[PDB]
Design a binder for this molecule. Structure first.
Ligand SMILES: O=c1ccn([C@@H]2O[C@H](COP(=O)(O)OP(=O)(O)OP(=O)(O)O)[C@@H](O)[C@H]2OP(=O)(O)O)c(=O)[nH]1
Ligand SMILES: [Mg+2]
Length: 306
């Protein structure tokens, strides 16, 4: 490639933490807001980090921490066909998503100030210089998936989250299963899976910056999911990032061309990576991989002359 091993390895590094206790303080300050609110006294909820910070795949210190405030005492369920709430002894629920979301807004407002709380389409942005909190908060209800493994045991389900965007479209995600699956792949690749995720994101950013390639449908989440689908041998068998990235591009290109990409899941295993309601298509990923191949000059320029 046009880049040195030293340069590529630098682009695999985790994002610097400018505060040693940023995640710690962020969780603390949000948990403080809820626990001091008497309207959450009878509710069971969890505050946890998801997205790039949760997966240690963020490449920019300046980026937003994704914090899920997950209600668990009320939840949504997916049942095997023909089953209903009453088959598990469950009610329709004591509190609605909208009621929960308004309680969360009151708590965060009292803690942070009406000026420092903005409701976005898929998150509540906290800009609190006072508490040093810069966070996107996702109020969600726990999603019990009983259908995936065919459980009739109320205690046996796949745990996801469900919330409604501002437009009231339904979102179901499996952030905890995502995180667990990525740690597992990182353990099987001597921590090179996440290093590879980070260098591909940085190269996407560089390609855009230097006007080589722009496609808004190539998201950070998509890149993490794509590299998660690269077989461990492509990460384990090579002694350079130069070669690891070369074989990664060849495999992804090969996998779109031979239609095996259609069986690829997101990191959670709970949805297909490519489907008609994703922002991206296989054509977007083909273009991305082709632009990266060209940008990295894996086909060396004639006479090494650009
Ligand atoms: O399970 C998921 C998780 C995410 N998404 C899509 O990716 C977008 C960004 O979500 P994040 O949790 O913030 O991902 P992250 O790794 O932090 O990337 P970054 O913040 O660095 O971009 C989601 O909004 C969603 O895409 P849209 O559906 O909103 O277009 C999943 O789809 N499922
Ligand atoms: Mg994010």
């Amino acid at each position: 490639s046009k880049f040195s091993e030293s340069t590529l390895s630098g682009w695999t590094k985790p994002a610097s933490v400018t505060e040693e206790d940023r995640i710690e303080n962020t969780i603390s300050m949000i948990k403080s807001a809820i626990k001091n609110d008497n309207n959450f006294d009878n509710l069971v909820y969890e505050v946890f980090v998801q997205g790039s910070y949760g997966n240690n795949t963020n490449v920019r210190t300046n980026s937003d921490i994704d914090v899920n405030i997950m209600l668990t005492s009320t939840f949504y369920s997916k049942y095997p066909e023909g089953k209903t709430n009453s088959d598990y002894g469950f009610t329709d629920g004591t509190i609605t998503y909208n009621e929960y979301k308004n309680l969360i807004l009151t708590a965060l407002t009292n803690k942070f100030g009406t000026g420092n709380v903005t409701v976005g389409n898929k998150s509540i942005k906290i800009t609190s210089n006072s508490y040093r909190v810069e966070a996107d908060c996702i109020p969600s209800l726990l999603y019990r998936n009983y259908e995936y493994e065919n459980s009739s045991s109320p205690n046996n389900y796949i745990e996801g989250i469900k919330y409604f965007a501002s437009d009231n479209t339904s979102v179901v995600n499996y952030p905890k299963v995502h995180i667990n699956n990525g740690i597992e792949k990182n353990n099987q690749t001597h921590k090179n899976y996440k290093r590879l995720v980070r260098v591909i994101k940085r190269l996407r950013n560089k390609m855009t910056a230097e006007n080589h390639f722009t496609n808004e449908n190539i998201t950070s989440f998509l890149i993490e999911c794509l590299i998660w689908n690269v077989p461990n041998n492509y990460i384990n068998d090579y002694d350079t990032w130069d070669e690891t990235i070369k074989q990664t591009l060849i495999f992804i290109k090969s996998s779109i061309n031979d239609n095996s990409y259609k069986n690829w899941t997101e990191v959670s295993g709970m949805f297909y990576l490519f489907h008609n309601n994703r922002k991206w298509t296989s054509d977007d990923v083909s273009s991305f991989v082709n632009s990266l191949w060209s940008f990295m000059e894996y086909l060396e320029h004639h006479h090494h002359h650009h």
